[PDB]
Amino acid sequence: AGILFEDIFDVKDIDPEGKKFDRVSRLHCESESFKMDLILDVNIQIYPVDLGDKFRLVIASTLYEDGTLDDGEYNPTDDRPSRADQFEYVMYGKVYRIEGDETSTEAATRLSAYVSYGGLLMRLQGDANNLHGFEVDSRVYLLMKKLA
Amino acid sequence: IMEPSIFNTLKRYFQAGGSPENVIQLLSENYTAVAQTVNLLAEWLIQTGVEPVQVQETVENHLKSLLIKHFDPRKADSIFTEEGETPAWLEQMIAHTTWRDLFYKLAEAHPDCLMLNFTVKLISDAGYQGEITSVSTACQQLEVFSRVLRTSLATILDGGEENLEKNLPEFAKMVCHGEHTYLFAQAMMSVLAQEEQGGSAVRRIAQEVQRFAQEKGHDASQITLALGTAASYPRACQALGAMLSKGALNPADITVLFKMFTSMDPPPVELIRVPAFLDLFMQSLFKPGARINQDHKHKYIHILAYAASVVETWKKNKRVSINKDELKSTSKAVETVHNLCCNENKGASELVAELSTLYQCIRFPVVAMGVLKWVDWTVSEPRYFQLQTDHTPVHLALLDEISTCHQLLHPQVLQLLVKLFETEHSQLDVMEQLELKKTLLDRMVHLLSRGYVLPVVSYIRKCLEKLDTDISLIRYFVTEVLDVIAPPYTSDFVQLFLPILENDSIAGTIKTEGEHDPVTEFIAHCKSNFIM
Amino acid sequence: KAFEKKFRFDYTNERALRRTLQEDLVKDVLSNAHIQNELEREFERMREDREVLRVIFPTGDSKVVLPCNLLRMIWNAQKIFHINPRLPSDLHPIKVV
Amino acid sequence: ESDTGLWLHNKLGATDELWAPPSIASLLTAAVIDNIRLCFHGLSSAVKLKLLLGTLHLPRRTVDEMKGALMEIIQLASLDSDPWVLMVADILKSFPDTGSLNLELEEQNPNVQDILGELREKVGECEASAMLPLECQYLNKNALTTLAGPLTPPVKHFQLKRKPKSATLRAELLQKSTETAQQ
Amino acid sequence: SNRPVMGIVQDTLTAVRKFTKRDVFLERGEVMNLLMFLSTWDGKVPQPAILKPRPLWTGKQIFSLIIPGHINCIRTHSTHPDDEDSGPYKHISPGDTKVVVENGELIMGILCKKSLGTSAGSLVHISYLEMGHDITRLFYSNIQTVINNWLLIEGHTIGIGDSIADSKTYQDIQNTIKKAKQDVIEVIEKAHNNELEPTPGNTLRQTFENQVNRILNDARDKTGSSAQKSLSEYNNFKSM
């Protein structure tokens, strides 16, 4: 209900070319089953992610499970039940670029969606059958949750 | 010449009836002379020209195929072959099966399923099982493909290391055309490699096929791990499967592996001996860049040492005596080499200094292979030859050390040397380029000294004949080789070294030698050896 | 060859037109030959402009001051009108010309 | 889903490719497999071969979830008259159960018998100067002795009068290293 | 020169460069304190970039609140690697050094003087041309006020700790100086013995002078490069 994408990833690398920023680091992660790459900027201070972790990641168009399609204003007093209570790290941002391996003759097979959560960048390189819900210049959430 | 159409004129002659105006006109459609005979007389006319050689009949058949390619009648091919007859295809495959049906099934290959079936069955009827297969895609019907695989394996196994480079693409384009055929071939490789009495060559051929699969685009590492015994211990094999499906090193994955290793219950060592895994190790460890973050680095070194160090005794599928008493030295050597590749102190102010320790390290085979890969990735950088000591022979001295202390790396050493020799170095002086080539030829001479000679002389002959290099370079190679060798001469060396010397610049070899005689001694010994 | 590949708008290819334009516009372009003639004429004009530029600028640089920033305006139109450029477009090239 | 045989033939029926296509773990869910189990004898042999090869590319946990359905598919595949399907089922029957593939692969097939007999004879007679595997460029001297016997010496094609100038080069560079080490 | 002349002056520029970094996060109270100073704010607090653990706004969201209308610009940070746009990550910058303002919202990038300064094609120039001129006045005022009021929380300084490198860097500098000095001395001893040969086009004294100046300039450049590899990303000289 409003979910654009859901998959379980596995942390493989943490900012392998050096740590550009002390509070935020990028994770080079691979999917558990879907064979797709995810490079994700996360705040290590408030939510430490260690190398070798496994987490669920659910891009949702909205947090409200009814799909009420909020505008994007900060409403800390809205007691409508959202899906964020299932998760522990919610990032809101806009997807700004969907590039892919395409040709002028046939369709694109491998898509690459770019989304910025304020300033925290995330690239999701997967197949077109899994990234079909993404649209350029739309607002999405992150909903990641680590699990053993 | 409408005689050439007796058959169809026949049924229109006895049973013409009605208005046979078209019948008479088609009986009258060969308005020319006997030009069928005149076309054969064109060969007699060519007898007065340049050449109507058997190539004249070949050209006639080529024009035959050229105007045949228009129709090439798939249309009624299935009907005309389901007629259960036609020595046409049988006779053509008996006599002219060189490339006619080859181009025929290379053209469309969707229709003419029964012409294709007859041609494929005749290809199976040919002795060498799969050389005229009109398609390299002869991996679809099992009874054909299994026997073709058997005969190709026999050819390669009777060939050897020299045939390992020539026959392996012609063998891998079949077993990598289809990955189900790849699975069949790899299962056969596994079953044949169950034996220790000569199964090492089968394993080598399987590894080369897997390398070609990785080149062409297979994710064949999962198949390789499925065939192996590593899947008996599940989680380590799954970690390897993910890592080799990504083709890169993850420190978390190696920590997962390292937690399972160096314990009292290690996995069977054949899970870590897969060569692509070690190649990825070399890529992630000994690239001039690609820094490793100093914390799981010792885990990397220990994993490599355990891969390249320990022995075992499989007494009926169980081990009772392994040792780890030399992987400390291996770990120390690999750690020192990685530190030397990480310090990169400008113009080797330290690379030259610790060269004795490097020589001590390269006594080990894994260390030598890693240093070879690192020198490959360092020297082959464009615009590298701007530091010059004696036209920079330091890394080439390391090449000499690698060629000296080992023998199995010689194919890779020669590959690197010929890759550098073929590479034109821009922005360098022409005399400087020539002296760089001279240094590379000195390295090739050093390779020739340590036993590995025949591929080197073969490449020298290849570059003198095909895409011919400078004759002065071959003259210098001959001069340097003949200043160090003389008496006994195994016959293969003479047979390979004679034509380059006796043909094409006899005179340049001898100018001022005097005290030790020039090629004249080799000519006399060649006369004394062979049978004139 | 790069100029011809980037500016000619080859109309003979079916699948490229299918991907870039909507099917009604695709059949409008493929059916009529007058539109093809006009597209060929505008490519002729662009070859003429290329020759004129190469006369004007013998040195190989193109950083030139002009009033309207056309690339930025195209980007602004895309951002205002919510293009989603994955879908086939719905503007007739003859309208563009 | 509905018409799942046609769905398998659509997503895997491109016969111009013979590899296990990527995202095969995304195309093989337990519900999809349970839909395959009743329409397994209908779809073509090429798509069936793709399915049997892709069942191996699943992760270990997903196989361990519902290995019974995979074994049922294997048992249905072993009954088919196709040679490729029969062979691949014979190989793959032991993968969901143990994790390793089958190594006893000799019954019900004269082809394997002929290939194995001829190649056993060939391998038995071709032990002279055997091709060492690509692993032999890495492991040490005594490890190689344990694995595949001692080191085969090269052919002495000639006799060496004097060592080449590379010996002089290495001696000079060793002297230079000694001189640089004491600075 | 068809470019703006106002730009963004030193302290606001440094505070906004530190402000728009990727690792800058703001508490709700600090966000409200900052948004109090926006003259062109429509009274709607934006959705945070971090919701569940510690609702935490990124500074780029506040700066997108600053950026007026819907303007689109692509600029490069002063320390953007030139080999970044060649290989991968040309759209997901690992250094956050690729400034993209899109639909009036700052997507990514760190705004140096090449983004907000007096250079042509900058953010302020496009804000002047695409939007009005009163709007650009509001843009300047909002940038100054809110970035100074964030700088109050952040704070910026310079000191004697920003002028001292570690002993390894000092050893490198002294070794380079000694090597260059000995090289100059040996060039001098070559020049005395007439072993120096004149460059075609000038006298021997100047072949000598060219050699000495070349060696000393190489020493200066090498020592400067080896010094500026050791700022540790908190040095305020590097910040400015």
Side-chain angles (χ1 to χ4, degrees), chain B residues 512-523:
Chain B
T512 48
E513 298 188 2
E515 56 181 4
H516 292 290
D517 280 334
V519 305
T520 303
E521 286 292 332
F522 186 78
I523 300 302

Side-chain angles (χ1 to χ4, degrees), chain B residues 297-311:
Chain B
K297 167 184 178 181
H298 72 280
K299 298 179 178 60
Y300 284 166
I301 308 305
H302 188 270
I303 289 300
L304 268 82
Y306 185 80
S309 303
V310 297
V311 311

